[PDB]
Design a binder for these strands. Structure first.
Ligand SMILES: O=P(O)(O)O[C@H]1[C@H](OP(=O)(O)O)[C@@H](OP(=O)(O)O)[C@H](OP(=O)(O)O)[C@@H](OP(=O)(O)O)[C@H]1OP(=O)(O)O
Ligand SMILES: O=P(O)(O)O[C@H]1[C@H](OP(=O)(O)O)[C@@H](OP(=O)(O)O)[C@H](OP(=O)(O)O)[C@@H](OP(=O)(O)O)[C@H]1OP(=O)(O)O
Ligand code: NA
Ligand SMILES: [Zn+2]
Ligand SMILES: [Zn+2]
Lengths: 384, 455
RNA sequence: GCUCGCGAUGCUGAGGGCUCUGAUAGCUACG
RNA sequence: CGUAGCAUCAGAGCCCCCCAGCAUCGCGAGC
């Protein structure tokens, strides 16, 4: 009921589990089967009374190359922790609309207006990420197993494999370094059979630890937001996790003025979670506070089982962003740059988020850790 | 509704024969057959139930009327003279023929070179029957030469994407056909060429070439989403490493030979764009155009990744604004079809070699895609030097008054090419059409590569 | 300490095949 | 009113084949 780091971790684990149970008919629903669960919890104080479960999700798979959407209707990455961040973005958009509904609703929105233009979180509002296991890539690859009291730390931390950017590789096991032989995916290349490379969860969480979790579109309204803590339900290796999350790019420099290399609390839970039996389900559930029920997405297609777009896809998010843009006065924008109303350009209007991304990519390259691998440029050239 | 189930309700006593299996892992291919009302049908797929469902598809479509029609899966018919059969049946015939001949050249798909990502081929039609179609050439490959291996003297291939190799081996077929006409007064009836009223030669009537590619060609014809089938036509260049393409920016300088080893790479055009180019200046190239009138593909069959709207854009529609073309040149609008038993995607690395074979060769030639030369470092039969040698042989034989464009004592490859006045003018109009459509400059590779001579 | 080459034992998303079980939509046959 | 037999999903069991990294250990070499 109080908040020192271990009981905070145990509390967020408790909360995400319990919310998941409520949404799955006390874990009796067919959509309770999972190999990885992840969740976001918001805190407003030292009291579990004030702590609320912002989102929950599951999933261990990414999209098949054939199913990338040139309209932003599919989910590329259904690892449970990626999905939980996207559900958090739905919550952030909803809180912006709650804010500017009327001057009486504004006091219940988590945002205020900011001295530097745009909007920011109100004080002592924090976000905690929970994952039932360690994130693929640098935080996991070297030790995919529960730790032991006997020699817990890494015996070879100076190997060049340590810290490397690594891609999930379509149809292959493992997470693969960005070998210096090629770095450009092409849309036609991938449809043909080049395997879709998707940066590992450890790398995405490092990137969120530089540019914030709110993405580029939301940064046009809101100052960057960062996870206060990362809590792992099993497979917690501290040296590996802290390497993966921030310590490998401490060489980053020249970040634009609100951005920083965030170093959230990392922690495991008291009673580590149990490896779930059975095959891993091919679906991913997701829930954001203020939803009546879970949404279930087929991870390999990026869409629900009837083929509808997720409330979490590029296109739905873009639509949320436009709803808010329409209600935001021109003077209150964090960027007055004008860009056409296509997903890719609208993102380019986040000039200093883009600059931050550049410093990130440079830090990895200078560090010898490889060049970040992006999606085919055609992925984001769509309109509403 | 599921085809196997519908056919079971129709003819409940179903025996499906399992015709054995090919490949392993993702390159698995099963074939499943059934006999309905006396006729014998086939289906191909990665897994038995898909092969079975496609056999049942052939069944219900052949014995009864068609099936589901997604719409992008249905095909643009050609510009005029809808000659050769139903579009789908011609498509499936062509794809079977190329796939068969590839089997023949690879000891029924067992040889080490049978493993491939893209298979392409050219098939010649001479009548309305599909009995006397004939495979002219067969090729594979999805890689290009590295600039470290380009030749100042014409001994290396630049581009080994399957369809490009297919066209060049076609050119070998065309030199052979002219040599056939010339070397004996009687072999003219056997040839595909005849003398042209405008001078030079032209193809005999109803001789058509059909291009087959196991996938939509790289570049603009592939920039779309296969499962949302309901988008701007830029030019693109192949990238330094691996398959696929990126669009060109019009403001980048044209290449100069040493300076594109020092700086920006020696970029090569995407297959979608090269095939639009072929739809304007024809497939025979410039040298052959000194001897022959322009030749055009009549069909383009895609063994997978077919979508009618985007293929149409990439092949002709995106330069429908071209005008002022030389005599005999046109914007060719061929048939665009997919096939019934479409190929599955095989995620994985593309092989490093390119197989090529023309009708008349006795065995495949295996080229290292990255060196543009064969297994033993020799120049292939397709490189610029060898083709110019064929062309010079043919120039030694044509009387000077039969040349469609006058040239005497040819010495330099580039000079001989420049002699093709009208072809170079059609090339100029194609480049103009692309620029004025807002789609980009053609990346002309440095012409110092063509400053060489036979001896 | 690392890197490179060779070797060994394991670890960690695809494809394929076969068997069982429940539904759902069918289709026959018989009393 | 039942039983038997002849596409979908959904779950379970037994196999085969990848994947390109990673761990641990050996051998040779270089820094
Ligand atoms: O991490 P994910 O949840 O999978 O989504 C991200 C996100 O794109 P979307 O929020 O539009 O889906 C990034 O965009 P930002 O949030 O940083 O604005 C984008 O990176 P870019 O903005 O630089 O395009 C990145 O795509 P990429 O992999 O090309 O970096 C993409 O990750 P995935 O492509 O793996 O979904
Ligand atoms: O089949 P490709 O590999 O695409 O070869 C063509 C062909 O070159 P060669 O005939 O010497 O092999 C073209 O020549 P023509 O058929 O038009 O005579 C030439 O175009 P030029 O007319 O400008 O020589 C073009 O090169 P480019 O892209 O520079 O126009 C070149 O394609 P590659 O250069 O990519 O091999
Ligand atoms: Na990107
Ligand atoms: Zn992950
Ligand atoms: Zn190509």
């Amino acid at each position: 009921q109080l908040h020192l780091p271990q009981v905070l971790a145990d509390a967020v684990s408790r909360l995400v589990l319990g919310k998941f149970g409520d949404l799955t008919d006390n874990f009796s629903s067919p959509h309770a089967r999972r190999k990885v669960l992840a969740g976001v919890v918001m805190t407003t104080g030292t009291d579990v009374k004030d702590a609320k479960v912002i989102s929950v999700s599951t999933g261990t798979k990414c999209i098949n190359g054939e199913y990338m959407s040139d309209r932003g209707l599919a989910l590329n990455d259904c690892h449970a922790e990626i999905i939980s961040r996207r559900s958090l973005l739905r919550f952030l958009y909803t809180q912006l609309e709650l804010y500017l509904n009327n001057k009486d609703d504004q006091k219940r929105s988590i945002f205020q207006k900011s001295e530097r233009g745009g909007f920011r979180l109100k004080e002592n509002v924090q976000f905690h990420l929970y994952i039932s296991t360690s994130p693929c890539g640098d935080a996991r690859i070297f030790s995919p197993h529960e730790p032991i009291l006997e020699e817990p730390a890494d015996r070879h931390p100076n190997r060049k494999a340590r810290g490397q950017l690594r891609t999930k590789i379509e149809s292959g096991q493992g997470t693969i370094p960005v070998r210096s032989n090629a770095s450009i995916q092409t849309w036609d290349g991938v449809l043909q059979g080049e395997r879709l490379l998707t940066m590992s969860c450890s790398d995405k969480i490092a990137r969120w630890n530089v540019v914030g979790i709110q993405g580029s579109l939301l940064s046009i309204f809101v100052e960057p937001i960062y996870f206060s803590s990362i809590i792992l339900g099993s497979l917690y290796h501290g040296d590996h996790l802290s390497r993966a999350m921030y310590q490998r790019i401490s060489n980053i420099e020249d970040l634009p003025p609100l951005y920083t290399l965030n170093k959230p609390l990392l922690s495991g839970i008291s009673n580590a979670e149990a490896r779930q039996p059975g095959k891993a389900p091919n679906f991913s559930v997701n829930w954001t506070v203020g939803d009546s029920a879970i949404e279930v997405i087929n991870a390999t297609t990026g869409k629900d089982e009837l083929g509808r777009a997720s409330r979490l896809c590029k296109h739905a998010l873009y639509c949320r962003w436009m709803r808010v843009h329409g209600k935001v006065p021109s003077h209150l924008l964090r960027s007055k740059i004008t860009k056409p109303n296509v997903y890719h350009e609208s993102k380019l209007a986040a000039k200093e988020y883009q600059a931050a991304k550049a410093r990130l990519f440079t830090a990895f390259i200078k560090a010898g850790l490889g060049a970040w691998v992006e999606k085919p440029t055609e992925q984001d050239q769509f309109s509403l």
